[model samples]
Target: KFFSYILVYRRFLFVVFTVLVLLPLPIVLHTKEAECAYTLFVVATFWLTEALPLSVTALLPSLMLPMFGIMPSKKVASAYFKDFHLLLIGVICLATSIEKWNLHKRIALKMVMMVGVNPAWLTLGFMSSTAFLSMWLSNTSTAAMVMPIAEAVVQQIINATKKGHVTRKLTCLCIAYSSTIGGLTTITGTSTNLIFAEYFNTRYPDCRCLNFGSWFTFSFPAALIILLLSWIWLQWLFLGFNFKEMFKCGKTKTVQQKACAEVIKQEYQKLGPIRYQEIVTLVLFIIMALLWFSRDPGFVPGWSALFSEYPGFATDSTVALLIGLLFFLIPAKTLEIVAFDYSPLITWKEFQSFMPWDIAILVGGGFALADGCEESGLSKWIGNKLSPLGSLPAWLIILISSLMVTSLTEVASNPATITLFLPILSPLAEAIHVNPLYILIPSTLCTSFAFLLPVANPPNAIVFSYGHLKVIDMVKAGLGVNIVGVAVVMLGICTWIVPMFDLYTYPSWAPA
Candidate 1:
């Protein structure tokens, strides 16, 4: 009974614990180092406990760091916005334009119609479509856009099958799980990946391996492999009907199968023909992707390399801003090149609302935290202190590190979880005589692997809102995939990812 009360007051306990225990640790190292540690624990506690909004917790460093004499307020405040920050804003604007034109819905329904109407194929269709969409847009928004379509399909299925309770649950889980997993495939797919890239660049300015092409090479295979495994696993668990059984079942109830097909067809037809706005958005998205991929893409001398005079002028952010600017300038509804009443793709008000300033602030906070860690010598001090653990085998280090972050994410925000660890882990990699990317990449990948709880990831919570699942349902299903995810990430990190990033040996840019 007493423990129950304490559990209910966990937030307060976190405060008490941080203040009494972590805050007052003897200032053996630099006093500023101790202050950084203090600020970190406070921020981590608030983030983990949700005692404050994650963004609000992020503001602590700038507020506290100056007062503690760890860093000046001006420098700490400046860390919040950077070039990558603008890139993030630009990419999100492009994604919003896609959403604004209803392109996402049209794309999803068309793909489902092409994949056919069988249950297994339908699962594949929803999961694969959601996954693909998430690689470009926010996972939460992708899940939101796909859910109505998924629910429609599930409703149609319930009319056909006595076993639809199981099928509906599986369908919901498929969309949710795929959205979270799919974001892993691209750097701009999720805010956390961008955060990882930003920190990587900040930590090792000379290492060019964290760019878009390099990130895709490291993450996509792992994402694809895990997605395939998840699809198969969900089918085996909830969809006991094989293809033959499904075919026989469909034949037995042709009317019901037609009903399901009509639902998809009706939805697609409602989208009607693609419009000028969608074409413009789609073209812009493709061009942005190509620019991102080809700009100094690792294998080839890209178009960016063509400019020898000012080789650095064309960058990912430059391309992103260029495309985003076109959205405002391009006429969506007007044909006239000059029209006073033209409906631009996105209005400034919509852009302001769509922009995740909280996330921008959150990213800023993470950057500030990383900066303070480096500035105060806290990163090196903690790294050296824990360097003895370097004696452990590398695979074990990767496995344990992946597991720790995975578990943390199940309860805390993924970005906050990564923000807390990356600064510390970067130095630890150097201390252990290993490339930081070896640990950092797996850590970043695992942040999206929080599959076991409704609170694990936003997609998980979105699915649970359908009320088809109990907490036990999520736990029972999520546990197996979560384990598999850890193994896949660990194995991939040790195997191909190392060679892909050429991380077999530590890079020169890593801190010694």
Candidate 2:
């Protein structure tokens, strides 16, 4: 479980990728502006490949744009803190409370208990819960939350069974597969989900890609089906479990209870009681999520269920955060005779850390790349190049292109990949007379679908490294899920969900 040398291996990859990025710079010297754009793309690409925080990679354009003369220094610096960045920040802040309180471990244990210890049942439960959690939180955070509990569980089972390879393999398999399946449940489950949301926001702002509340309603069922299918596939393909042994845990009840109890006690101890701060934090989080989700429908009959007025008071991130701030002013407990006052429940340090600047930067960089691709004429050229395949059926075109993009995402920078392709595909979708969103949104979301190899996505790497998961094992698990996941996206988008939201059909008139 403890390996330090992997750090060196990662560093080595980082160095080589960086060097390769600069290899082609000599030819582009004449086109300094374009070269600067390309250079930012490469730098962001290499940084992303190293699994550096996404925002750090995203800063490339902010740092590069002024240098290339596309924007002034002061302007790009200020523009970094746009609306999406604040929303990402609020999400991070809320996630911090869960981390600080170790509420995540508590949730994970309850999930395990609900699923029971039988291998197949446990696996299914893990998959389902991960999917459910991912619908609201980032997949990386969700995986981080569950991974420790999973490790403790695996270690207990291993120790009890004398570290039997079969038990170890099965337990690790559950964790590896579950972490991945989690990302499929919602648009915000992974960074890619946010990417799709933004693309839809820009491309089809009028359509509304499932506001916070509607997102869960729209994507959850399909996600559940895909996760369920993956669970069945994993059980059959990996363990080859028989009907008789499938529902049985391989340990005594006393042993299982003691093991679970030990982990729970440790988790609760590391973080103090779920305090008044936690309650305050939670209430504010719920309010913010609800308002954000229900904002678009504030005045209309179908849209105003959550609020009574136009431009409802609680909809924006700033307002929601201000409400969260009120918790700090109120004391969780009062001392008998203290003169100085002591109720600072929510700290600034906590709030600062909560904002996801890194993720926002990553997303911003993704947008910059899209801008560069179009400005530099690469996106349109790629679209023209793709015209050769226009005669293919729409369904097949989506399937093949999505599969190709998803597979490429496994090795390339996912955000950059989205940026590179979106400019190309959006126009292609337009040229073909189908909704551009049908292609763009799915392609953007599918960035998270590259679960086959460690290099593809961060969460996969996190679980794979310690879980004794093999590359082929991931491929077998991810290949089927990826195939089904993309198909579900297409079906869900084309059939009802998009149309229900008025996203399926584009505007009839010309842009002019």
Candidate 3:
């Protein structure tokens, strides 16, 4: 009943409700803090209600903050896209080129063939492939790329053995789940990570401790733990207690397994042979990843230090742009009229088409909100209000916040969720007298744990779009994985994070 009514007048309600807040908040609070909170309150409400598109709501701070005298128009507008956002642009360009070359599919088909096709192993193979690709490419792109290949395999199993129902569902589920798990591993893996990275760097610009390599050291292993547990959880959900069927301990591969293998090999063969274009794209992607690792490994002197002119000048975007430009400059194959060539690895038309400008703007909106909250002193004021949270045990705070963010992500934009939370969280940490990242780092990671609803995230939406699964199926399976993720992330934050970031003591890099 409520949903029906909300949908009918959602837009009308949002407009009226926002005006009500704006007019009244200024009277009560007597400062820009009230106006800034009005913007945050509108975003938080609009994001939950879905009365307006998430990105559209995110755009408010840019408009509202300038009018409220919190930040100037030009300064507020700049928050939309800068720093980590550029890294997103660069990687998406690389992803589009990889898609154009069909390099992503080539890698998938090959990995599946190598891993074989038993039910449990089949799940692992697909999960591993989707997960790994998502580490570099967007989680959404990785799932879409593998969907067709996985569909063909599911169909082949049905045609040969007449029992593809399980495989069909399993394939769909693993791709979406793994894509999520994989995004946990790398900074560029998803929009949420980049949002956090930018916030961390923005707050601690001069110190600049977080890097791709440093982040991966903590996240990759943690992601692996989640992925492995999720793989098992999926196995039990789809295959049941049929350990014999799952592992095939004593028996050989089934007709169904062979059928799946044939389809994978057939798909790999259809690519004919890996061309130099794929070769170049793979090499460039690898080189970019390597460059990121060595830039500031947190263990050795980074090659970035080689640039004595500006000691910490090189950022991950520097690595992404250096190699990203080569994607346009390097020819896939030369044509008669082609100079740099009629066909480089990716063309401008294709590149522009592949660019996720909406999501980019959505991320920008979050950044703008974070900036607005800080500049207006809203976060500090709110943090002072929320300061009583410190009385609770540290682990209890982390545990509660993790669940809230994870559940919040299941319904809202994960990047936006982190953007709005982190600014306030910064001040909360100051009030509580602990390192900011004690809460900030884990909560940023928490946003990626969205697995509940089809609309929970893009990867989930992509999986549901295939028309194979239902809400019940997603909820039943996703609930367990959500629990698993919460436990794992909580453990990481409570234990390893303390030593890794030295979170026991607060740092001056962030101010209340």
Candidate 4:
């Protein structure tokens, strides 16, 4: 009967929610305020439940906002796609090229081979390579690529140590954790980072520190610190310090170590030689990075500022889009026959397949929500209500927000989590008379720090799918790192980020 009620009465619940939320809202408040509240309630409820696909739920603003006279349909639709959306598309296109050319595997294998095969070094190798790749590729893709190699390494370790579950679990965790941490190092690395950027720019358009170079400068070191701490923590948790002794002291090679080395070598050799396509992709990747970094990242005037005649024409998105187009123009392989077997570096169909359109829509929904919050005075109203929090110290707010987002991310998608929270945080920071970045930067970093559950992130799920880790195993390791991540992010925001961006005294660029 309970099951029947849940399944059969779900639509009834939806209808009840609609009637209860919408029927009397206009009588109690101004039209714009009521409309915004009604739309937010519907969207939030749909997101909290799986009443519809998140992307489809995202479409509600386009329909409802206009009908309620909140915002025009064209402006609402325009919010769904923007420069940041294009930036994601362009970077993912380059990532697709890397995968298509097998460059990611080549790079991972080379790094593993170079790190040698001691159990400690092998784990380091997996984490290092995965972290490096994830700084450029999607976290999910990087984890997926690194896991097979990691699995092979673990199998060899298991054969010698006879520690099947422990070894495999450690290796899988290294891949997943590294991939997740590495993504925080760059803007293009994850959607959540860009979501923060989008909100920051929208709320404080003149704030310069949110640029890519500034972000990498502030976040990379913090991410790196947490990553190294995590690596040491993982080793202690899984391998123990005696792992050095397990490999035989000094230069003497243990049988297990040698076997691991051979496996890594074979994987590396299988790639034979890197191809022209690989080199081209690598060059493009490097160029994209240079453009992103060399542009004004806050501390100094940038190349973009140099373009006085047409400054608006150049941006990170423009560079990415231009480079992405080259992939189609450049030949991937040469074919003498008319057999129709050849293709460019990346086909349009492949691009279509890998592009995360759902995330794009999710981002658009967030933009619409931000606009609504501003137009309806909801942001100001929430700010006024929560203003008492200003009486507490800033560090306490930072710590609480950090822990909350990190913990919540264990259950929800990162983009969804940030979308739900950013609107509240933006106004809360203003209400508290602190820089919103002080509130928001830490929250954004924490959003990607979910480590305790398989459902937390795609990388966690990918490793769990291989069946090496039990839920308890992940929880044990995840609990430790999640704490460390929150601490690291909070400290970084207070110390380095504040000084680096002059955040302690709110910038004049921020909203008044």
Note each model's CA RMSD in angstroms.
3.5, 5.8, 2.8, 2.9
**Clashing pairs in model 2?**
55-358, 89-355, 93-354, 212-293, 297-303
lDDT (CA) per prediction: 0.80, 0.62, 0.79, 0.79
> Per-residue error at 344 for model 2, in Å?
3.2
Q: Would you estimate the TM-scores of all the predictions?
A: 0.90, 0.77, 0.92, 0.90
* Candidate 3 Cα RMSD after full superposition onto the native fold (Å): 2.8
Using lDDT, give the best candidate's number.
1
In model 4, the clashing pairs are: none
**How far does residue 51 in candidate 1 sit from its true spot (Å)?**
1.3
lDDT of 3 by residue, 377-459 (tens): 88878888988989988767877777788888888878768887888777777788777778877888888888888877888
User: Which residues of candidate 3, in runs, are more than 4 Å off?
Assistant: 1-10, 27-29, 161-163, 206-208, 245-252, 336-341, 507-512
Residue 46, model 1, lDDT? 81
Clashes of 4: 0
1 or 3, which is superior by TM-score? 3
lDDT by residue for model 2 (1-512), tens: 23666565786666567646675763556564455546555655655465455565667666666666656667656655445555455566567665765566666666665666565776676666666666566666676667667777656544543334554554555555555556655455566666666666666555544465566666667666667777777777766758865555645556765665565556445645567556766676676556556455324434455455543233345644555556446565555478566746656777776455565676677676556555555555555667767677776777766877887787765666776667667768766666665666567657767767776765676677674667776787678767777877777877766655555455543121
